[PDB]
Ligand binder design. Sequence first.
Ligand SMILES: CC(C)CCNC(=O)[C@@H]1CNC[C@H](CN2CC(=O)N(c3ccccc3Cl)CC2(C)C)C1
Ligand SMILES: *[C@@H]1O[C@H](CO)[C@@H](O)[C@H](O)[C@H]1NC(C)=O
Length: 337
Amino acid sequence: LTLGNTTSSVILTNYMDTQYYGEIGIGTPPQTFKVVFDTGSSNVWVPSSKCSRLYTACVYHKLFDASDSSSYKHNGTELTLRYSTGTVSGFLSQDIITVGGITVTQMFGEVTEMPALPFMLAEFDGVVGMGFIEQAIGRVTPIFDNIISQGVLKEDVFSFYYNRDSQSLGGQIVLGGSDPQHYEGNFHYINLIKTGVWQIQMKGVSVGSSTLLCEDGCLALVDTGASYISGSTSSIEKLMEALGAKKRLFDYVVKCNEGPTLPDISFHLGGKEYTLTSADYVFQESYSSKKLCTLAIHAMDIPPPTGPTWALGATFIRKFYTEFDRRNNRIGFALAR
Ligand SMILES: CC(C)CCNC(=O)[C@@H]1CNC[C@H](CN2CC(=O)N(c3ccccc3Cl)CC2(C)C)C1
Ligand SMILES: *[C@@H]1O[C@H](CO)[C@@H](O)[C@H](O)[C@H]1NC(C)=O
């Protein structure tokens, strides 16, 4: 493990508080893509020019054209990424990828099958997984592992800052460090339950005074690629019940007036109590009683080995700056400023 003296940031754009993405270039000359950085997976993919135009999602995103890249190297083995809320499919390819000014040779998936629901709902074109090789499909090396192999980063860590807001910085990732301009107080760490997955032990979840949730203990996925906080269907039904929340098709709501009356939600992680006020988790876009406001906390059942498990996504990261320590297998939380 070589540690140099470089640091890179990626500027992130915030879309509707649910999608955070920046820019990467692929090939010679670079073909730019908007991608999301997902600690909850470990592959890289962008949609491919070879994606049937009968896939509307492809007609609406940037497509990588190998035949315009003088650095592309063929491989072609099949690939399928089955995420919690949708699937993509295609084949492996190799080329140069610029990310934060760092240039790295990388194997990625050229997706030739991307469903309208949901990809038609995506602002970005692709994903850059920030997880370990233990979660990478097709045994493909992760892009951070590859960057780490170059020995240029100060520390074997990267940090996420998601702003709430929308002219202003949308978000920011620091490869090989953190940006103290974005957090305050001290960091506080937790060791990953295991290596291979950005997940940690969670002691309890309290809704207001009356602590409903996992009084015993549970798992928490720290997930930069997720818009919401998610828990087991079971856990979430009880959580929601105590908020007077009404469960609809894909989300929970409450009469827009009742939003601010909603109590605090805390999550106990290694000693500190991480609390979110209603303003932190409601989409207050009205104050009327005649209108339903949505909650940034979904119900989602994740299977073994990973699940069952809570997910802490953009709803949480927005309040607490997050550093992913690969060297020590821990995750620091600080108060985002
Ligand atoms: C292969 C294996 C590791 C699966 C387990 N990992 C996972 O499911 C990932 C865990 N992090 C979250 C991630 C969210 N996905 C869900 C998804 O639909 N996106 C999405 C989000 C918002 C709008 C539109 C879209 Cl499309 C974003 C995105 C990133 C494609 C799935
Ligand atoms: C895809 O990469 C793997 C991993 O090294 C390799 O064995 C395989 O031969 C590649 N396929 C081709 C056709 O280049």
